[PDB]
Amino acid sequence: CYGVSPTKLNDLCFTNVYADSFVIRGNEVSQIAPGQTGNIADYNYKLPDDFTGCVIAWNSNKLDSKPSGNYNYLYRLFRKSKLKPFERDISTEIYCNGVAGPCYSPLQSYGFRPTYGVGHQPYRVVVLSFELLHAPATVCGPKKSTNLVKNCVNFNFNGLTGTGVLTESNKKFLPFQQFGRDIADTTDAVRDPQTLEILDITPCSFGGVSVITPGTNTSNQVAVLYQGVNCTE
């Protein structure tokens, strides 16, 4: 799981999760990762360097393999150039004349047979592409929502945990904007998933604590100075 945890996943939200489904050869499971090189990556399925998600893959020799030869799975072996990340190529052109024999057919078939041991068995791959960002969250975990309180409590807006107060804001958030960010790269305002109101995120009250005390060999009474904080706060 790139960028996410395999167990700490039911407590977060996502914008749009896409499950890429494809079956590759057993020994060919080496390039399913961000920034890999090879024939399969550069010809059939390439992952971007900024991929985020779990590359789920398991053995399926008992399902996608037949002793008589399961030739329903093909793979592109020849191509004019390298394949871009997240690109599909279904063309059956010959990579010359109209037919092959000299240029060859780039669509070869896998020899999926139960006789072949590990390495040549079919493996089903489910690429759960995750995109967690400032986009409005459309899918979340099974966690339930709590009552909304305003004016110093912990908040959880679409997985964004923190601590601060909530106040009625007068901003102009756009319908496609869900999270706000200030100069300090912190979240200053967030849109509630249930109600379309905008609430500012402000940290609770704090301040330096300066202790005014004489020498120990003189007395033990001390004074407290809450610098930067008024007495009414």
Partner: antibody, heavy 121, light 109 residues
């Protein structure tokens, strides 16, 4: 003692895709490699491939990669051959061999009775 | 590579014969991957000489082999009347066994 036996001799026409079998007993068949040897009348021996009864890790000869397949039934410890697109060049003797406790996995320890496949019309 | 063997040889009763066979390859782990097989006309082949450094069980001691570079030699002492059969050399260094052209052993008397 360990024993090995094959099926009876068969004579077919080019294009019938006959099937032969071989049964062994007296030992752990699933722990010994087994294969077949092709012998044409008047020439030397030829090796097609072998198979492991546990998992069918078939290793065919480079000259027999698309002419015949080798299979084995692990439930009954019986091998089964299948010739595709039978032609006039398949009128050769087929001897089977096993691994045995004599040599390595590729060394042929013992032999079978042999099965004659004569192409005729 | 292909193994080379003489098609027909001539011997005699009580004499010795040295079957020659070249073209044996080698791989990492050893070079003694040489074995011999005997097949009487109309009978199943039988393993007579394998791992020439040793001898199989049940095979008479009159059969022995040796190695010299890429050339192997099969020495058979005391050619009897029932020794008239074919012999083949086998090389299994590249995990692929190969057989020679066949040596028909004949004896005179």
């Amino acid at each position: 003692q360990m024993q090995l036996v094959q099926s009876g001799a068969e004579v077919k026409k080019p294009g019938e895709s006959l099937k032969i079998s071989c049964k062994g007993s007296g030992y752990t068949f699933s722990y010994y490699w087994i294969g077949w040897v092709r012998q044409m009348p008047g020439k030397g021996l030829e090796w097609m491939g072998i198979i492991y009864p546990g998992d069918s890790d078939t290793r065919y000869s480079p000259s027999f990669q698309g002419q015949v397949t080798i299979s084995a039934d692990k439930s009954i410890s019986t091998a089964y051959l299948h010739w595709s697109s039978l032609k006039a060049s398949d009128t050769a003797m087929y001897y089977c061999a096993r691994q045995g406790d004599l040599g390595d996995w590729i060394l042929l320890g013992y032999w079978g009775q042999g099965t004659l496949v004569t192409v005729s019309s | 590579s292909a193994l080379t063997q003489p098609r027909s040889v001539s011997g005699s009763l009580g004499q010795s014969v040295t079957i020659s066979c070249t073209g044996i390859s080698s791989d990492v782990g050893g070079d003694n991957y040489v074995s011999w097989y005997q097949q009487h006309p109309g009978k199943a082949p039988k393993l007579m000489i394998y791992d020439v450094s040793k001898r199989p069980s049940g095979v008479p001691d009159r059969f022995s082999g040796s190695k010299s570079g890429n050339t192997a030699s099969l020495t058979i002492s005391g050619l009897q009347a029932d020794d008239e059969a074919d012999y083949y050399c086998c090389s299994y260094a590249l995990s692929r066994v190969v057989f020679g052209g066949g040596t028909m052993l004949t004896v005179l008397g």
